[PDB]
Amino acid sequence: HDINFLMKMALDKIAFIPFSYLVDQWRWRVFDGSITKENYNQEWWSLRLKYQGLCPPVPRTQGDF
Amino acid sequence: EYDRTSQVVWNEYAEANWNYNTNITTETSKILLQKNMQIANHTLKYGTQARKFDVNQLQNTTIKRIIKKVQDLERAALPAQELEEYNKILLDMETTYSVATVCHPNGSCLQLEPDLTNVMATSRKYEDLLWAWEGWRDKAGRAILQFYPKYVELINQAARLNGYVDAGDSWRSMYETPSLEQDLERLFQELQPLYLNLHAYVRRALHRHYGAQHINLEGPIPAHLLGNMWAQTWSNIYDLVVPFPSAPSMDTTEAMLKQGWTPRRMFKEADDFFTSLGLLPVPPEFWNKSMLEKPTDGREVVCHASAWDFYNGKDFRIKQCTTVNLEDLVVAHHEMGHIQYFMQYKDLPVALREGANPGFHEAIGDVLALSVSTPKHLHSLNLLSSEGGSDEHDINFLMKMALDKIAFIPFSYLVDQWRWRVFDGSITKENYNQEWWSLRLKYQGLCPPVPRTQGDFDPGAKFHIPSSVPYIRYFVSFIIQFQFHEALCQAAGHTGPLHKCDIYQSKEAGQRLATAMKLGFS
Amino acid sequence: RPWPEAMQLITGQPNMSASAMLSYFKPLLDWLRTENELHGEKLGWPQYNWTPN
């Protein structure tokens, strides 16, 4: 029971930690001018892969945002 | 006293470097290691003596500059065990990159400099190019990845002891610019549109040749379908991207075959052009004491290097050997510029015997090479070209010259951008290759032909990465050499079509180059 | 008042640390490490250039 409850709480919180770290990181880099406009989705997915370890299920071309 | 002892110490060290780079054995490795220990000892002793001095209160400039430059110990700031480990790591990386040969296990094996580069620049089959590229990246990167994190940690420790911040400041401090990164980013953003247009045109040509399965109109081009193992200077072979094949278009392939055109006489021609510019000539012992051809045995040299200076005022050898080509001629001009720069400030003290800016060396070496590559000067020497007779010939020459010196700007920016990021801890060991390929996609327009998983150290395929030399000097020099050429052409009395302006018996331009190039690091 | 003062008032230190988060999940972390080593799996994603389709 202890392991099940702790696993549920981990899925709730620790799974959320990296996404919340990455979204504002991307926004900060956008505001600083380090993202420009040509590659909005590319840097976002690079951050997703680097921090949260997720991959685009379908090839995300530019112009998707 | 520092100059007096440093002259002989560094002369002996350069002799040891010659002996290691020409007579490669294990005794050469041992001698090189122990002489590195000796030069580290001397540098540590004199830097420790100079640390008792104060630079701020010294009311002068030249002596202040000497003391400031001697203040840092560079590598010799590490402890004894750490310095020994760092030297061993650097030597191991160099020797595992130079000797690495990738081949089909059938029995036939190829080397990078002789064959792999040739078979990549010559072949036009997708599968063979993919095999060569993947095999070389595999072998070199997987060899070097084992050492690289240790080298990063040790160089960071050495820079931190020297007073810098994580070995990025140490290499950016050679330019004496607190705002170097911003200026270089602005320059790259300025050059971006022309590079984008060239990339689109080259992608169109490659799609015309290789079809649509490999290359699509929308998207990056694979990094191996360009002409180089690293795509640093892609499509220097422009036979596939020639705008319109015209009759008066230069061949520059048989124009150095029916006249012989040995490397000795090509270097003689480069030196003759240098002297006709109005600059002092290279000593006669250089040709008969250096080496620039293929060996008589199996062990000749390291894969790639540059000119070597011995700081004793007489030894100005050149090590490059690449047989005979037009790229060989331009590289010979570059190395002659390197040697002439090493030779101009012989009068200066040893501490100032480096050059005004790490990019200035290459820029001044390559500006005359850019000047001599125009069809007019080629017409004036052994060739017959239309010169400015036809605009189509001019546009073809411009495209061929822009496949060089452009598409090299993004790579020369990218390599040192990645190295600065890894040195400052932003790139963790776990994603050395992912961030490198992200930079390749972002700055250049290249994509990995094969899925490149973690554990493949692709950046280790470049020679400058294990050899641990800065690479952004090439970007700076490629930015600056065009300014130098513009000024020298202005001194020629005419500008007109600057793309075909040629410098030849321009005494005033040579004098202007000399008065600002003799300054050195002063 | 600035944040560190309230941080010290609530707990005792004017700093942010992940030690409490790690200590809270310590039994789960240990059991998960044991299960992962039993199943023979490697941490991270050392095939980063992977896309399902």
Ligand SMILES: *[C@@H]1O[C@H](CO)[C@@H](O)[C@H](O)[C@H]1NC(C)=O
């Ligand atoms: C190069 O190494 C060989 C190894 O047998 C040695 O005999 C020879 O003296 C070396 N070359 C020179 C020029 O000393």
Ligand SMILES: *[C@@H]1O[C@H](CO)[C@@H](O)[C@H](O)[C@H]1NC(C)=O
């Ligand atoms: C370097 O100097 C130290 C000073 O303690 C000395 O012990 C050592 O033998 C020297 N090494 C060489 C190669 O001269």
